[PDB]
Amino acid sequence: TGLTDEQAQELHSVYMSGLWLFSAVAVVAHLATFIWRPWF
Amino acid sequence: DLSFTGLTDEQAQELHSVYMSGLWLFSAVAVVAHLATFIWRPWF
Amino acid sequence: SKFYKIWLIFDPRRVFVAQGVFLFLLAAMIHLVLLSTEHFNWFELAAANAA
Amino acid sequence: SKFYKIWLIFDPRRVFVAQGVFLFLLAAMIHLVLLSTEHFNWFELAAANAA
Amino acid sequence: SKFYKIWLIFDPRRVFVAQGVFLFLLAAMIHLVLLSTEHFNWFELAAANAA
Amino acid sequence: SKFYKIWLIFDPRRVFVAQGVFLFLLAAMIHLVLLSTEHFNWFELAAANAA
Amino acid sequence: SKFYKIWLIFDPRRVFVAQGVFLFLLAAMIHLVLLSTEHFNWFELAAANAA
Amino acid sequence: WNSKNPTDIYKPAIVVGVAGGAVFAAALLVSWGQPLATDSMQTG
Amino acid sequence: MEETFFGNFDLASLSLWLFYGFFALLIYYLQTENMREGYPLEDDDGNTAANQGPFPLPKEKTFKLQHGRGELTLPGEDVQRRDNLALRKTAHGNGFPMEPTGDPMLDGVGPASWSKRRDVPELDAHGHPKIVPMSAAEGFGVSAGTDPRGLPVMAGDGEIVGLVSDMWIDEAEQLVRYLEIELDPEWGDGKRLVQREMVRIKSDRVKVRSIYGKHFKNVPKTKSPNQVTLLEEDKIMAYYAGGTLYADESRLEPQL
Amino acid sequence: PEYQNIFTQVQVQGPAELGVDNENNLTEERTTGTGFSQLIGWIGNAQLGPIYLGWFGIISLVTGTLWFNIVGFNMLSQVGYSIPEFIRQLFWLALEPPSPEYGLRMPPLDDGGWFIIASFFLLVSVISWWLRSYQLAEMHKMGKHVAWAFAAAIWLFLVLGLFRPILMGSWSEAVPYGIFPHLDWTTAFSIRYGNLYYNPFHALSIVFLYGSVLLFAMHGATILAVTRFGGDRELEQIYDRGTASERAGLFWRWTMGFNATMEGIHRWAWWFAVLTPITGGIGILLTGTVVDNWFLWAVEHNFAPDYTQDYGYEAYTTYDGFLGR
Amino acid sequence: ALLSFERKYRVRGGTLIGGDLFDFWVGPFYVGFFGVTTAFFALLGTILIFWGASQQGTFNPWLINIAPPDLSYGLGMAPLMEGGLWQIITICAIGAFVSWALREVEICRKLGMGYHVPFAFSVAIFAYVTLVVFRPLLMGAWGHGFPYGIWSHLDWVSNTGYAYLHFHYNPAHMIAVTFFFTTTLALALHGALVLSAANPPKGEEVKGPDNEDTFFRDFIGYSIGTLGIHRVGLLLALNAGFWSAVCIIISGPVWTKGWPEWWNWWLEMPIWPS
Amino acid sequence: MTCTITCWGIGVLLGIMTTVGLMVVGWSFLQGAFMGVLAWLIVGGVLAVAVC
Amino acid sequence: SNSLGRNCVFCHNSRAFYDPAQHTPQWATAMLGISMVQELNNEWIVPIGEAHLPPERLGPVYNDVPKLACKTCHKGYQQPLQGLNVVADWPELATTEGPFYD
Numbered sequence A: 001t002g003l004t005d006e007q008a009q010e011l012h013s014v015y016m017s018g019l020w021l022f023s024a025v026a027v028v029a030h031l032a033t034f035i036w037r038p039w040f
Numbered sequence B: 001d002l003s004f005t006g007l008t009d010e011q012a013q014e015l016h017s018v019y020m021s022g023l024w025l026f027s028a029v030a031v032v033a034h035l036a037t038f039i040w041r042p043w044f
Numbered sequence C, D, E, F, G: 001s002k003f004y005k006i007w008l009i010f011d012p013r014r015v016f017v018a019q020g021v022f023l024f025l026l027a028a029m030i031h032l033v034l035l036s037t038e039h040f041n042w043f044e045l046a047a048a049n050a051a
Numbered sequence H: 001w002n003s004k005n006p007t008d009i010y011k012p013a014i015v016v017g018v019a020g021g022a023v024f025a026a027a028l029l030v031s032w033g034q035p036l037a038t039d040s041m042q043t044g
Numbered sequence I: 001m002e003e004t005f006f007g008n009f010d011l012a013s014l015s016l017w018l019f020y021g022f023f024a025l026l027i028y029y030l031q032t033e034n035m036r037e038g039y040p041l042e043d044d045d046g047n048t049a050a051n052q053g054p055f056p057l058p059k060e061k062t063f064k065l066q067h068g069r070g071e072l073t074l075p076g077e078d079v080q081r082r083d084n085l086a087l088r089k090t091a092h093g094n095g096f097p098m099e100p101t102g103d104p105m106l107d108g109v110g111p112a113s114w115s116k117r118r119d120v121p122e123l124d125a126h127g128h129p130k131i132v133p134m135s136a137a138e139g140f141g142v143s144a145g146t147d148p149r150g151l152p153v154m155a156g157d158g159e160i161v162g163l164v165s166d167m168w169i170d171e172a173e174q175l176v177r178y179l180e181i182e183l184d185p186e187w188g189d190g191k192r193l194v195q196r197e198m199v200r201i202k203s204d205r206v207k208v209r210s211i212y213g214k215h216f217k218n219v220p221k222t223k224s225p226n227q228v229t230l231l232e233e234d235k236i237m238a239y240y241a242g243g244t245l246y247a248d249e250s251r252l253e254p255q256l
Numbered sequence J: 001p002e003y004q005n006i007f008t009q010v011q012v013q014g015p016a017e018l019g020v021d022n023e024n025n026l027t028e029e030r031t032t033g034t035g036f037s038q039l040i041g042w043i044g045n046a047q048l049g050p051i052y053l054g055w056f057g058i059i060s061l062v063t064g065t066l067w068f069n070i071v072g073f074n075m076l077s078q079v080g081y082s083i084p085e086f087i088r089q090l091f092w093l094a095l096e097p098p099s100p101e102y103g104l105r106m107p108p109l110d111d112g113g114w115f116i117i118a119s120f121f122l123l124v125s126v127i128s129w130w131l132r133s134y135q136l137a138e139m140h141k142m143g144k145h146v147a148w149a150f151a152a153a154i155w156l157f158l159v160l161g162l163f164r165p166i167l168m169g170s171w172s173e174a175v176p177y178g179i180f181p182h183l184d185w186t187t188a189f190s191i192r193y194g195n196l197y198y199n200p201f202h203a204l205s206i207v208f209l210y211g212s213v214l215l216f217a218m219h220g221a222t223i224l225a226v227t228r229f230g231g232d233r234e235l236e237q238i239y240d241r242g243t244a245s246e247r248a249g250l251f252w253r254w255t256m257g258f259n260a261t262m263e264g265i266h267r268w269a270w271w272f273a274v275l276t277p278i279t280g281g282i283g284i285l286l287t288g289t290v291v292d293n294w295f296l297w298a299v300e301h302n303f304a305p306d307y308t309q310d311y312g313y314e315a316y317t318t319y320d321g322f323l324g325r
Numbered sequence K: 001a002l003l004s005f006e007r008k009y010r011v012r013g014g015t016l017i018g019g020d021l022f023d024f025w026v027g028p029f030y031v032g033f034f035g036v037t038t039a040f041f042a043l044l045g046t047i048l049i050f051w052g053a054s055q056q057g058t059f060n061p062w063l064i065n066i067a068p069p070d071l072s073y074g075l076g077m078a079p080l081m082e083g084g085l086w087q088i089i090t091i092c093a094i095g096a097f098v099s100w101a102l103r104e105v106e107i108c109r110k111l112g113m114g115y116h117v118p119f120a121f122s123v124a125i126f127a128y129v130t131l132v133v134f135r136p137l138l139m140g141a142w143g144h145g146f147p148y149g150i151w152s153h154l155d156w157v158s159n160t161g162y163a164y165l166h167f168h169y170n171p172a173h174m175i176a177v178t179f180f181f182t183t184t185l186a187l188a189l190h191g192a193l194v195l196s197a198a199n200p201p202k203g204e205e206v207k208g209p210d211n212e213d214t215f216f217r218d219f220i221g222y223s224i225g226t227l228g229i230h231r232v233g234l235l236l237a238l239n240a241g242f243w244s245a246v247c248i249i250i251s252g253p254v255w256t257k258g259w260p261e262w263w264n265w266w267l268e269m270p271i272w273p274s
Numbered sequence L: 001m002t003c004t005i006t007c008w009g010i011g012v013l014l015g016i017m018t019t020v021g022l023m024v025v026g027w028s029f030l031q032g033a034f035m036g037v038l039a040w041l042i043v044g045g046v047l048a049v050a051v052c
Numbered sequence M: 001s002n003s004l005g006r007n008c009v010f011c012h013n014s015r016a017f018y019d020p021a022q023h024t025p026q027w028a029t030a031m032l033g034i035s036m037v038q039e040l041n042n043e044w045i046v047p048i049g050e051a052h053l054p055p056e057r058l059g060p061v062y063n064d065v066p067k068l069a070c071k072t073c074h075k076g077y078q079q080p081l082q083g084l085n086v087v088a089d090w091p092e093l094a095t096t097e098g099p100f101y102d
């Protein structure tokens, strides 16, 4: 039933940390895919 | 003052600047994306 | 101009959520329309370019 | 002139929402009508101009 | 002449919404009727004139 | 004459709605009846006179 | 005579609505019947005299 | 600062998506168009 | 037989006309059977109308009510008519809506209007009251779904007005009828009943959307905590359904 | 959104209800074995209560099983007692009526003789079930509306298989005992006697069949709409009209200009459903005995539409054009 | 005129659009914003039918026939006397049916009752919509809708049914027909209980819900209850309308061969020995 | 509930798997779907009854 | 209809299967086909089958000669080979009184 200011500091820190980790693999996967078979 | 949401006049202007910053950043990516697409494969 | 007053009548919470659905639906719709075209299908374009 | 009094009749938040929905669907519908035809189909013209 | 009394018996806000809907549907209907014909279909005429 | 007494028995805001539907129904029906005839169809007459 | 006593039997409001509906449906029916015949169809006669 | 009043936040999103889905389906049916055309002849 | 009586009028044609005559009599009978309640017509002012319809009133029929409640002849004066209605006409003629003169939910008009039923509980075959709390009922328990006893009650505007204390069931049909609400001191004083058809049961709360937080203190109460009469049932249910239009001006005014 | 009363949100289960009783001593023929099913209780009553078994119920069940077995065991013998083939062709097999050459006489067992014997047991089973409905209503001191309504269904059941074959003087006019075969009979029956669409009683019976589904959707939704005012307690609303009956009446009065009462709705409901087979029974009876061709009857009586366009596909397209070549 | 109890229910408000501009009663009927549109569309469609009947040459209600355009015209507009009048009436008919359902929403909103009735009517509209616009759109021509004639629209059913060589073998027709014959059975039995309980033999007390509840327990061994029968009765009727929409939308857009040929999947299963 | 519905969800999920699985090894959609529907009712029904 | 690939309304009008005035012109061509099939089976196919066909070419139940019907030539189409002109190149099979090449 609602969140406080303190909770959002931890919740957003994790979410942004996970977002960069997920995107770190994605950018590597796209980079390797283009070398193997470019689409441009 | 007139307000249907409860925000004050100053609060809305402060919040609008944040909204405009995101909109321009989102649009800036779209423009450069559209610019690269047009030279790659024009539709005109 | 003086457009910051739109938040005096629209709730910023609802507008922010509403546009997210609208923007994604727009982006998905535009991409899939390009696939139907024979000229802007970048998947088929690579096949023609490769050969 | 004196059209500003329409806001004394219409609730600004109700008309703004109706205006927003009506404008988009009207804009969307006209875009398909162009796509429905063959002359005003910018997707197919690029393919035709490619040949 | 003295038709301003029509608002003494009809609610101004209720009439405006009703006749706004009527005006648009009438406008859309006549536009579609023109599109159905072949003489007044400006979309097909453009293709016909352009070879 | 003294036809003005009709408003002593019919409420103005229940009769004006009655003839508003009736008058537009006539305007729509008679226009559609003419469009069905081969002689008074002004939409196909323009095509005919265009040779 | 004493035909005016009918309004002590029938409510004037309901009779006036009743004959208003009946008279128009009468007028519509006879007008449609003439249009169904060949001799009294003024739409076809106008086309015929045009030759 | 912030506003702490209740709001039906997800109400406008659902109606936008439903309305957008109709345009989404209409656009696809104009771009690709009629996956199974099933033409028929008239014999009467 | 393949021979016609006259012209092209055979046995099959004769049976068709016999059904037409029978159907016309059947429609006349069926319509008059629906006029046992609500007639004569009356008008907006309360006087009997000059027009009464093409179908005359049917002959009187008698219902032998059980449990020693006497007889009942439907075509006649109606004992369910309400008096001193808090309404005023919005026009001098007929065919126009009435405007409440006070609080519509309290005065019981329009969607919140009840009917003057008998002031006795409905009885089962044995003769005991039909609807009783599960505390009095023996051997009854919740067998499926979510048990709402103990869950907080959330009003139409999100306010929490109390927690469900008991729940009234129809032991004759083993069906839940009402939920007792233990009103908080900040919202009410005692217990109130809400019918099962105006409550949505969730995992952690029960939601009633027709009534705001401030309208709960005025819900009609029962004379006794062990049974509810037909009149009390009709007053309680009408109050909640009347809130679907009178809770706030946004509901009464047009949505577009 | 508001809670639509389509599924009960909580179920309460107590001691099983054994039913009311009077001096007729209903309890001595009752099974007194009850079971509760929670799955069905989401939409209706959750108790599978005891069933009253008397003599009309027992006779119908035993004779009905004999008809079921004779038809079923003949079908098994038809495929040479091959269970895999019996299952595969289950919807296609049947017990065909006698051949037309035998008239009303008893045909050989392999050529419709078992059909007559099986039909004899089905007739006994159906009539016995009707007597059970009539007897139960009398013992409960209730009206005989259930028996009368069921008698209307039996009227078409009797006409379709018993009365009409006698009038035509041939047992071959009966309906085969098959899933798909009695659909084949239905289609062939219409084709043989012209076009059954033009039978005035078939048209009339459809009016009451559509009205039955029409009215029960109207009545089912109206009661669910007023169930917030205790509208599902229809019997108490008849004896003491509450606000549920008033709003339900006023909703239809404001919509279509007239309404009914809580009792009078069930008179409309009873009569449309009862008139569905009553009118159809007359239409089937007249078919073959009197008319023999319904479209020609329609042409004679001037209600068959006439068309002025051409008929061949060559008048609207070409073979190459249809094929896109 | 009013009823003996109608006055206390005729209160202002509850409209969806238009407010008190149209919020009044004409006789027993309730006029709303959608009551105005219903009156316009229904009257326009009714007059156009008789205008087409006048040009058809006959006013006989059995013989009146307004037919759709040819299949050659496709999805476009046709001449009014060559099938275009049918298209206009269809627009009027759809506008009158949707307005009628929306008018029912206003009425049931003013009475503070549920919206089950307008929702149930929408299934009937959906069945009409899937016959006249949805199916013709998939099949690519407006000529696939049924004509507007009392006996002409039976000829459309006859030919459409025989266009698949046996329409009884349609799996959705099989399900949909089962729902009519059962809904009528449920309607007959439900209407009998209330009548039997409220009208016992002369000289006997009326029966309560318990007596009718135990009758079917004595009769078929199970009783669904007073609330259950209406709850399941609506579902049987709504399923009947829905499945009837399915059987006709798959005949031609999804299945072009004969309907008996559909069951070839069951006959030729790998499990069945040869 | 929250378990009977979940067990029903596993049944319908299995039926979809059964349909595509039989289509891979041959059969047909309608032939595969029939066993998928049949597997939905049996396995899904058993799961909701065997464990609650 | 299965042999032609068409349906019942290809030749008949469902409301009147008997009426000669409610039949498409394809009905008359199918009427000639019934006579053709009966003529071919009784006079041409069966007499030659019963005199030369080996036992393995006969039926499983009655050991009868195979016969032809509508689907033998049409297979699944409105016209055999969809109206392909297969006789223009073969005047030998177009008549029984000496080929006329012309």
Ligand code: BCL
Pocket (backbone or CB within 6 Å): E003, E006, E010, E015, E019, E022, E030, F019, F020, F021, F023, F024, F025, F026, F027, F028, F031, F034, F040, F042
């Ligand atoms: C066949 C040869 C001509 C033809 C011959 C005629 C002739 C002859 C006549 C018309 C008439 C009319 N024609 Mg034409 N007409 C033709 C083709 C057209 C076309 C077209 C696109 O082709 C159009 C749009 C029209 C349209 C019209 C309207 C201007 C008018 C009918 C009024 C009516 O029916 O509704 C009126 C009903 C109403 C009640 C609608 C009112 C609705 C509004 C929203 C109400 C708002 C009221 C609100 C309270 C504000 C009140 C303020 C007041 C000041 C108090 N015609 C062909 C080309 N037409 C008839 C006419 O009326 O002339 C005056 C006329 O005599």
Ligand code: BCL
Pocket (backbone or CB within 6 Å): F003, F006, F010, F015, F019, F022, F030, G019, G020, G021, G023, G024, G025, G026, G027, G028, G031, G034, G040, G042
């Ligand atoms: C065949 C040769 C002629 C022909 C021969 C005739 C003849 C002959 C006659 C007509 C008549 C009429 N014809 Mg013609 N008519 C023809 C073709 C047409 C055409 C056309 C487009 O072609 C039109 C529009 C008409 C129209 C009409 C109407 C003017 C009139 C019928 C009125 C009626 O039926 O309803 C009547 C409608 C009502 C009673 C309801 C009116 C509804 C209003 C809105 C109610 C408002 C009431 C409210 C309280 C305000 C009241 C105020 C009062 C002042 C108190 N004709 C052809 C051309 N026609 C008949 C007529 O009436 O003459 C007077 C007549 O005698």
Ligand code: BCL
Pocket (backbone or CB within 6 Å): J126, J153, J154, J156, J157, J160, J186, J187, J188, J189, J190, J195, J196, J197, J201, J202, J205, J206, J207, J209, J276, J277, J279, J280, J281, J282, J283, J284, K157, K181, K184
């Ligand atoms: C090609 C097909 C022909 C056709 C041929 C027929 C024929 C043939 C008949 C109908 C008849 C009917 N048709 Mg038709 N009909 C066609 C087109 C239609 C269409 C349509 C949209 O096209 C519709 C809606 C209908 C609708 C109907 C119904 C109005 C009517 C059935 C009455 C009834 O309820 O039966 C319900 C009654 C029964 C099912 C009998 C009940 C039997 C007893 C009471 C129960 C015994 C139970 C048994 C022992 C099993 C119990 C087992 C339990 C498990 C224990 N037809 C076309 C034209 N139609 C009937 C008729 O004419 O009525 C006048 C009929 O005989």
Ligand SMILES: CC[C@H]1c2cc3[nH]c4c(c3C)C(=O)[C@H](C(=O)OC)c4c3nc(cc4[nH]c(cc(n2)[C@@H]1C)c(C(C)=O)c4C)[C@@H](C)[C@@H]3CCC(=O)OC/C=C(\C)CCC[C@H](C)CCC[C@H](C)CCCC(C)C
Pocket (backbone or CB within 6 Å): J060, J061, J064, J065, J068, J125, J126, J129, J133, J146, J149, J150, J152, J153, J273, J274, J276, J277, K180, K181, K182, K183, K184, K185, K186, K188, K189, K220
């Ligand atoms: C005309 C309007 C509707 C209607 C009305 C109607 N039908 C009715 C009634 C009414 C009013 C009843 O009161 C009556 C009833 O009892 O309803 C519950 C009934 C009834 N109509 C029925 C069905 C029915 N209704 C139909 C149609 C309709 N009738 C319409 C929908 C139809 C159709 C489509 O034709 C049918 C088939 C029955 C359910 C019921 C009364 C039939 C009955 O019970 O007959 C007695 C027969 C038996 C008890 C046994 C029958 C055969 C069994 C299958 C044998 C047992 C097999 C078992 C597996 C044992 C195996 C043993 C071996 C392994 C050894």
Ligand SMILES: COC(C)(C)C(=O)/C=C/C(C)=C/C=C/C(C)=C/C=C/C(C)=C/C=C/C=C(C)/C=C/C=C(/C)CC/C=C(/C)CCC=C(C)C
Pocket (backbone or CB within 6 Å): E002, E003, E004, E005, E006, E007, E008, E009, F019, F026, F030, F033, G024, G027, G028, G029, G031, G032
């Ligand atoms: C089928 O057949 C075919 C042949 C095809 C056919 O067509 C048949 C045709 C047939 C049958 C014709 C039938 C038509 C008839 C009979 C014609 C009725 C038409 C009439 C009667 C015209 C009313 C005009 C009223 C207006 C337009 C008032 C304007 C009102 C103004 C706005 C004033 C109100 C304003 C106020 C301020 C009020 C003051 C208020 C206060 C003081 C408070």
Ligand SMILES: COC(C)(C)C(=O)/C=C/C(C)=C/C=C/C(C)=C/C=C/C(C)=C/C=C/C=C(C)/C=C/C=C(\C)CC/C=C(/C)CCC=C(C)C
Pocket (backbone or CB within 6 Å): D002, D003, D004, D005, D006, D007, D008, D009, E023, E026, E030, E033, F027, F028, F031, F032
């Ligand atoms: C079917 O047949 C075919 C042949 C195909 C056919 O088409 C036939 C068609 C036929 C017959 C239709 C004939 C149409 C008719 C008769 C309709 C006339 C149309 C009319 C009358 C529309 C006026 C609209 C006026 C406006 C647009 C005002 C705008 C108002 C502005 C916005 C001011 C308000 C602002 C304010 C501030 C208010 C002041 C408030 C305070 C001071 C508080």
Ligand SMILES: COC(C)(C)C(=O)/C=C/C(C)=C/C=C/C(C)=C/C=C/C(C)=C/C=C/C=C(C)/C=C/C=C(\C)CC/C=C(/C)CCC=C(C)C
Pocket (backbone or CB within 6 Å): F002, F003, F004, F005, F006, F007, F008, F009, G012, G019, G026, G030, G033
């Ligand atoms: C099928 O067959 C075929 C052959 C085809 C056919 O056609 C068959 C035709 C057949 C059968 C003819 C059937 C027609 C008949 C029988 C004709 C009835 C017609 C009649 C009777 C005419 C009434 C006219 C009344 C008016 C128009 C009054 C005007 C009222 C005015 C406006 C006064 C109101 C004013 C007030 C101020 C209110 C009063 C005063 C106070 C309140 C103080």
Ligand SMILES: COC(C)(C)C(=O)/C=C/C(C)=C/C=C/C(C)=C/C=C/C(C)=C/C=C/C=C(C)/C=C/C=C(\C)CC/C=C(\C)CCC=C(C)C
Pocket (backbone or CB within 6 Å): A007, A010, A011, A013, A014, A015, A016, A017, A018, A019, A022, C027, C028, C031, C032, C035
């Ligand atoms: C043919 O059509 C084609 C062309 C294909 C087409 O459609 C084109 C596609 C188009 C247009 C769609 C455009 C895609 C877009 C826009 C998607 C953006 C992608 C995004 C946004 C990625 C989110 C990643 C979220 C994660 C993975 C977070 C990780 C964090 C996780 C969840 C852990 C957080 C949890 C905690 C920290 C614990 C809680 C903490 C406390 C409680 C303290």
Ligand SMILES: COC(C)(C)C(=O)/C=C/C(C)=C/C=C/C(C)=C/C=C/C(C)=C/C=C/C=C(C)/C=C/C=C(\C)CC/C=C(\C)CCC=C(C)C
Pocket (backbone or CB within 6 Å): B015, B018, B019, B020, B021, B022, B023, B026, C012, C013, C016, C019, C026, C029, C030, C033, D024, D027, D028, D031, D032, H023, H027
């Ligand atoms: C079918 O037709 C075919 C031919 C296919 C077709 O092409 C149809 C296309 C058609 C019709 C185009 C229609 C497109 C239109 C009109 C474009 C609207 C687009 C707009 C306007 C862009 C907004 C961008 C907003 C952002 C992205 C802000 C970012 C904000 C950031 C995130 C800051 C944080 C947020 C806030 C501070 C807000 C308050 C919330 C809190 C404080 C929580």
Ligand SMILES: COC(C)(C)C(=O)/C=C/C(C)=C/C=C/C(C)=C/C=C/C(C)=C/C=C\C=C(C)\C=C\C=C(\C)CC/C=C(/C)CCC=C(C)C
Pocket (backbone or CB within 6 Å): J068, J069, J071, J072, J073, J075, J076, J116, J119, J120, J122, J123, J157, J158, J160, J161, J162, J174, J175, J176, J177, J178, J179, J182
């Ligand atoms: C595993 O178990 C075993 C057991 C092994 C098995 O096989 C399972 C059995 C299996 C699968 C059989 C499945 C049964 C099937 C599919 C039957 C469907 C039945 C159908 C569709 C009924 C059609 C309509 C019938 C009418 C309409 C009758 C009307 C006729 C009536 C009855 C009138 C009386 C007739 C007479 C002639 C009177 C004769 C009297 C004298 C002569 C006195």
Ligand SMILES: COC(C)(C)C(=O)/C=C/C(C)=C/C=C/C(C)=C/C=C/C(C)=C\C=C/C=C(C)/C=C/C=C(\C)CC/C=C(\C)CCC=C(C)C
Pocket (backbone or CB within 6 Å): A022, A025, A026, A028, A029, A030, A032, A033, A035, A036
């Ligand atoms: C001789 O020729 C040679 C040389 C051979 C040649 O051709 C060169 C070969 C070449 C170049 C190889 C081409 C490489 C390609 C195509 C690589 C594709 C693969 C790619 C790009 C990525 C894979 C790894 C993806 C994972 C493993 C992600 C992990 C994701 C995990 C599972 C997180 C998901 C879960 C969550 C986020 C939970 C969130 C929870 C909540 C939100 C609650």
Ligand SMILES: COC(C)(C)C(=O)/C=C/C(C)=C/C=C\C(C)=C/C=C\C(C)=C\C=C\C=C(C)/C=C/C=C(\C)CC/C=C(/C)CCC=C(C)C
Pocket (backbone or CB within 6 Å): A040, B022, B025, B026, B029, B032, B033, B034, B036, B037, B039, B040, B041, C019, C020
């Ligand atoms: C030799 O050169 C050759 C080969 C010839 C060549 O050039 C070929 C290239 C050719 C033909 C161009 C083809 C297209 C190319 C290359 C790219 C276009 C496409 C592009 C650039 C799109 C990527 C975007 C990536 C993300 C992932 C962005 C994230 C953006 C986020 C999403 C913005 C939102 C941010 C916010 C703050 C708002 C958040 C909102 C909410 C939370 C509501």
Ligand SMILES: [Fe+3]
Pocket (backbone or CB within 6 Å): J219, J223, J234, J266, K190, K194, K230
């Ligand atoms: Fe009921």
